Design an enzyme around this catalytic site. Structure first.
Site, PDB file in Angstrom:
ATOM      1  N   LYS C 234      -1.764   2.969   5.895  1.00  0.00           N
ATOM      2  CA  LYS C 234      -0.583   3.567   6.507  1.00  0.00           C
ATOM      3  C   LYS C 234      -0.630   3.565   8.039  1.00  0.00           C
ATOM      4  O   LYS C 234       0.375   3.274   8.683  1.00  0.00           O
ATOM      5  CB  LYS C 234      -0.359   4.990   5.988  1.00  0.00           C
ATOM      6  CG  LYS C 234       0.122   5.062   4.541  1.00  0.00           C
ATOM      7  CD  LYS C 234       0.572   6.473   4.165  1.00  0.00           C
ATOM      8  CE  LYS C 234      -0.597   7.457   4.118  1.00  0.00           C
ATOM      9  NZ  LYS C 234      -0.215   8.725   3.426  1.00  0.00           N
ATOM     10  N   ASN C 235      -1.785   3.901   8.612  1.00  0.00           N
ATOM     11  CA  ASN C 235      -1.957   3.904  10.068  1.00  0.00           C
ATOM     12  C   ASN C 235      -1.821   2.510  10.668  1.00  0.00           C
ATOM     13  O   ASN C 235      -1.072   2.311  11.624  1.00  0.00           O
ATOM     14  CB  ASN C 235      -3.308   4.512  10.458  1.00  0.00           C
ATOM     15  CG  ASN C 235      -3.402   5.978  10.117  1.00  0.00           C
ATOM     16  OD1 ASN C 235      -2.387   6.646   9.907  1.00  0.00           O
ATOM     17  ND2 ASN C 235      -4.621   6.491  10.052  1.00  0.00           N
TER      18      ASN C 235
END
Ligand code: K
Ligand code: K
Lengths: 78, 370, 370, 87
Positions: C234-235
């Site tokens: 996600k990051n």
């Protein structure tokens, strides 16, 4: 004179091994200092000083295996 | 003084060192060469830095202190302090005392030239006599980072004064240091040593990503010898690892360099496919006690990175290879001296004792669960 | 008795938790379908772990400890301790005892299900009420790593018992690392392409140094691995999308899985523009991540739980590598457990301390000439 | 009789320092202090040095407040008394 006995450091601990003494004969002991490392079947626990004074004799030396509860490990005088 | 040395140490150790930026080093030599203000700065600052680190020297385990090599180093520091204190009441504007001061700095740099290997032999003499106890080892590590960084800082000050007052560099500082040129030089020298100690050497690949200006080669204000030292050490390790983990001279993976420039950081990543090392062993690579057989290149290169607020980090992947990254400040205003101070806080670090440990340790003979 | 709670805490916090290896979990859950041995271990061990951490919750700053959310969490821990202590006198040889114990563990797990967001809410209730206090922040940081690691370990214990007695529990003996990587990617991609309308591809490579052609498998808890990978994906996706302007040229997220003798390493590399080094350290800070985001510090705890790590190394202007280090061997994969003792107690008695190193002036001296 | 007090004076934290600047106080009025505690940040042209408590007691009053520059050497910055009720 004060006598330091091996406590239950785990709920079902019957016995422990005195892996290493971290204090010497003549050394001062403050409440909370590392006295010895006690090795069990479940963990190696840093056994801490609970009563202040001076270490005079080691009754149960380093490497001694399977020492039961309440066994006098050392004698300390204030 | 000779007799009054501990009073002089007590006096000057009470002062904080004065950390300077790369910008301040640059502005000093941006126009006029002013020997006077430098002399008056350094005749006070050098005693301050010497005295601060000397208080920490005599705070270390006596078994390390009484060692011949540490005794010798400490005697150099006493002499150097005394040599400078002789200028304390001397007059600027008198050009002879300025000329004599420079002579006194080169003399100090010459006697201190072997401080690093000598201090290391001191730790070694301690090793082959007492072995190791957790507490003393902890203090030696803490001390050496500070001692070696103090050393880098003192050598920097002396280098600045002597180069200016005795090339486009402002002392040891290149205003337009080409990162890639330094990378190429460090590589070429290491390649040379490798190709003669193995008869095989990895190739080099360099890429640059300049995010501040996509089409400009990455430059910075830096001390090139400092950058060269770090890269040279990293290149040798990456070449040794690459050669020793491979069987063929024809197919050995290149060492890859990435230089990145952003708003705040200048990052240099060195990647080798030298087979890597377990994470357990990484932390050992920056310890001074473990790196003395039965090799201070890595912890010292890291101190060079840290000296101007950077860092040097290793991340390996056992079975594959290692990335090494140097972090530098992109801006000369942010590139400030990292100096140890002696205070009560520093004193406390030498008063540590063996403690229980706040995390559980497993048994070496764990219960058979069947 | 609820009244006797503080003495039950004293009794059980006096004991050290018992850290287990994944080998032990595996040897137990596959050989011992023995509910009695698990019951008798857990009826002692769970109160030991609860009491050890509750002893530390009570060492929190009054301003944190007194927030509604931390009080709610503390009350959960009190009740769960009381629930299990009901089984101390009970006969392990009765199956009603065993069936009721499993029911009590399900109840505890349901009760404690929101401990993570509730504890974070409490820290937020402290943040948005009591300005800034550095010493309080460091104690909170110290506490939270331990509290959340303790929590991970308790849930593990409960999961093993419940999954076995009403995969070896949650442990996969033959966990396909690549499959877990793909699963985590597929889920993050889904959230990315449905919140940005654009997503980077995945590239995976494997280097098995132990056996060159074998797909990399390990003994591990898949959900822990997934949790870590999911957060990191996600990051990397967010960073990639936010730093690029084109839908068509998004750089892929690259995964390298390496297996060596000791480490299994998973590196995730993005070209998301990177972050300054000074900001990397605050990514694992709970106080920094509470707005006005506990994914990273908790993911690292998952890696540390069985003696691994999770490290970040970015290059500002280019992108970031994230590495999960895991133990390759199940005997090395031992629980990382906080223990309350005098050593831990001292960590809460921290004072406001002077700097160890020199701090540069905010307005450094002008060194330019006349 | 006057309660036995000790007074903190702004010293030279650099060999060529004459004036001082109190950046931020780290001990509020009423707090106890041990020999080694951080008292305040005293900034200058050369460094920000964390000023340490050299005499145990309690903080009674801040004489020279925050932000105030050009504070001479030996100038009393705060009052420290031996006992707690003496504040
Ligand atoms: K000092
Ligand atoms: K305990």
């Amino acid at each position: 004179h004060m006598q330091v006995l091996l406590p239950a450091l785990s709920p079902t601990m019957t016995m422990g091994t005195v892996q290493r003494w971290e204090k010497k004969v003549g050394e001062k002991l403050s409440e909370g200092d590392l006295l010895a490392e006690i090795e069990t079947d479940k963990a190696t626990i840093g056994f801490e000083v609970q009563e202040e004074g001076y270490l005079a004799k080691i009754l149960v030396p380093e490497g001694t295996r399977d020492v039961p509860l309440g066994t006098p490990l050392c004698i300390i005088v204030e | 003084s000779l007799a009054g040395a501990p009073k002089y140490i007590e006096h000057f150790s009470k002062f904080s060192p004065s950390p300077l930026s790369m910008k301040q080093f640059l502005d000093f030599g941006s126009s006029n060469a002013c020997e006077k203000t430098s002399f008056t700065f350094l005749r006070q600052e050098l005693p301050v830095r010497l005295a601060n680190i000397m208080k920490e020297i005599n705070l270390l385990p006596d078994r390390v202190l009484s060692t011949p090599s540490v005794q010798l180093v400490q005697s150099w520091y006493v002499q150097s302090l005394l040599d400078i204190m002789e200028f304390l009441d001397k007059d600027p504007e008198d050009h002879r005392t300025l000329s004599q001061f420079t002579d006194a700095l080169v003399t100090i740099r010459n006697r201190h030239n072997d401080v690093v290997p000598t201090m290391a032999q001191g730790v070694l003499e301690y090793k082959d006599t007492y072995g190791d106890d957790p507490v003393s080892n902890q203090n030696i590590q803490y001390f050496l980072d500070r001692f070696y960084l103090s050393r880098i800082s003192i050598r920097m000050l002396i280098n600045q004064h002597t180069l200016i007052f005795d090339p486009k560099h402002i002392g040891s500082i290149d205003p337009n240091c080409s990162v890639s040129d330094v990378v190429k030089d460090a590589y070429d020298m290491a390649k040379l040593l490798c190709d003669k100690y193995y008869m095989a050497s990895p190739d080099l690949e360099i890429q640059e990503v300049n995010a501040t200006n996509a089409t400009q080669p990455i430059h910075m204000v830096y001390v090139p010898s400092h950058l060269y030292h770090m890269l040279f050490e990293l290149f040798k390790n990456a070449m040794r690892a690459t050669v020793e983990s491979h069987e063929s001279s024809l197919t050995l993976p290149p060492i890859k360099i990435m230089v990145a420039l952003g708003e705040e950081d200048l990052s240099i990543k060195m990647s080798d496919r030298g087979g890597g090392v377990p994470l357990r062993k990484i932390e050992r690579l920056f310890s001074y006690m473990y790196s003395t057989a039965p090799g201070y290149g890595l912890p010292i290169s890291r101190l060079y990175a840290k000296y101007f607020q950077g860092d040097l980090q290793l991340f390996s992947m056992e079975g594959f290879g290692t990335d090494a990254v140097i972090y530098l400040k992109a801006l000369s205003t942010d590139s400030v001296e990292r100096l140890p101070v002696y205070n009560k806080s520093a004193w406390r670090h030498y008063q540590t004792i063996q403690e229980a440990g706040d995390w559980c340790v497993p048994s070496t003979e764990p219960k058979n669960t069947s």
